[PDB]
């Protein structure tokens, strides 16, 4: 029974311009088995209308999902993706960086 921990990336669909509205993106991949949980956070708190792609997998059978919602970034509001999985003893939070 293979299990693989999720790779995670958090980023925006357009280069962050700041004060202008955009989409935050949490992209999990490389995991197995398929049950995963994913929240998008703003200053710790979770965001209200998050949508995800349909579950698919890669050539090596690992799964991938994109999670996205709409947001207007600012200098100092903090964004983050947070991710749980059987392979994770606790949830893993990965913070958003405009140039990453």
């Amino acid at each position: 029974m293979i299990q693989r921990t999720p790779k995670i990336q958090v980023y925006s669909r357009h280069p962050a311009e700041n004060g202008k509205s955009n989409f935050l993106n949490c992209y999990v991949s490389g995991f197995h088995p398929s049950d995963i949980e994913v929240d998008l956070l703003k200053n710790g708190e979770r965001i209200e209308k998050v949508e995800h792609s349909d579950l698919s997998f890669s050539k090596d059978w690992s799964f991938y999902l994109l999670y996205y919602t709409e947001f207007t970034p600012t200098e100092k509001d903090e964004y983050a993706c947070r991710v749980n999985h059987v392979t994770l003893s606790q949830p893993k939070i990965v913070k958003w960086d405009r140039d990453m």
Partner: protein
């Protein structure tokens, strides 16, 4: 360019008398057009690209039938494999099937494949030549035999070599607007110091389709590697893709390093340099 149609099915069991989870998705190149999903509110094959909402009631009655069909056979497989592997009913297990079409730049058949996984491992798969099978382990061997008795390779081949290409070249024509684009990547290069003696350079590819792409980084002439972070290519969510490549460099020496981009939209390969 070449093109490809793929279908991806995933079936997960749940402990005890629970019904399994089933999910179908179908892609043209890198573009999802159909989903089915047992946990969802419709129990039909639903559209996902606007060019497929073009298809009429029949098309959707039929696909839904095909999907329900597969799902039934998946649900049976899960019971079987459980026996074959001597496993309790406590556990959730997983059954995965990929199959599909590749055509070249003239839309003539190039190749096809069919592949089946069990708990994240290759279980059985059609060889490149669409006539023979690879069975991992000896439970796969029992299958191989059953599927040989039923001439399953021939059937799949008749589909792969026929209707699969047929319909792909339909959806290319119906999708002509969107599916038949090639979007060249839009580049930039960010520079931020990380110490008094080092700086990070990041090479960005944005808004490109299809996904396949190749950023790399070289020092004088030949390449750094090992020394470079590189995020796996990712979806932006508007049907385009992103990627970046990064190396930390000795400050003040950033005009030794150079960055290379390769992609189908780019007639002539870019080399980017810190552009201050």
């Amino acid at each position: 360019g070449s093109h490809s149609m793929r279908y991806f099915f995933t079936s997960v069991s749940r402990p005890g008398r629970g019904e399994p989870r089933f999910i179908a998705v179908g892609y043209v190149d890198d573009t999802q057009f159909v989903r089915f999903d047992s946990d969802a509110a419709s129990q039909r094959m639903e559209p996902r690209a606007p060019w497929i909402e073009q298809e009429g009631p029949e098309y959707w009655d039929g696909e839904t039938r095909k999907v329900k069909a597969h799902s039934q056979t998946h649900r049976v497989d899960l019971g079987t494999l459980r026996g074959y592997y001597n496993q309790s009913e406590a556990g959730s297990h997983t059954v995965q099937r990929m199959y599909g079409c590749d055509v070249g730049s003239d839309w003539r058949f190039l190749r096809g494949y069919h592949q089946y996984a069990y708990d994240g491992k290759d279980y059985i798969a059609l060889k490149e030549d669409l006539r023979s099978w690879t069975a991992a382990d000896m439970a796969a061997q029992t299958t191989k035999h059953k599927w040989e008795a039923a001439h399953v390779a021939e059937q799949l081949r008749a589909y792969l070599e026929g209707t699969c290409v047929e319909w792909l070249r339909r959806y290319l024509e119906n999708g002509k607007e969107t599916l038949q684009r090639t979007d060249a990547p839009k580049t930039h290069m960010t520079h931020h110091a990380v110490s008094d003696h080092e700086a990070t350079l990041r090479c960005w590819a944005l808004s490109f389709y299809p996904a396949e792409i190749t950023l790399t980084w070289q020092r004088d002439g030949e390449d750094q590697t090992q020394d470079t972070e590189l995020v796996e290519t990712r979806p932006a969510g508007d049907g385009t893709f992103q990627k970046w490549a990064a190396v930390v460099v000795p400050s003040g020496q950033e005009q030794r390093y150079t960055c290379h981009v390769q992609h189908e939209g780019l007639p002539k390969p870019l080399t980017l340099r810190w552009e201050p």
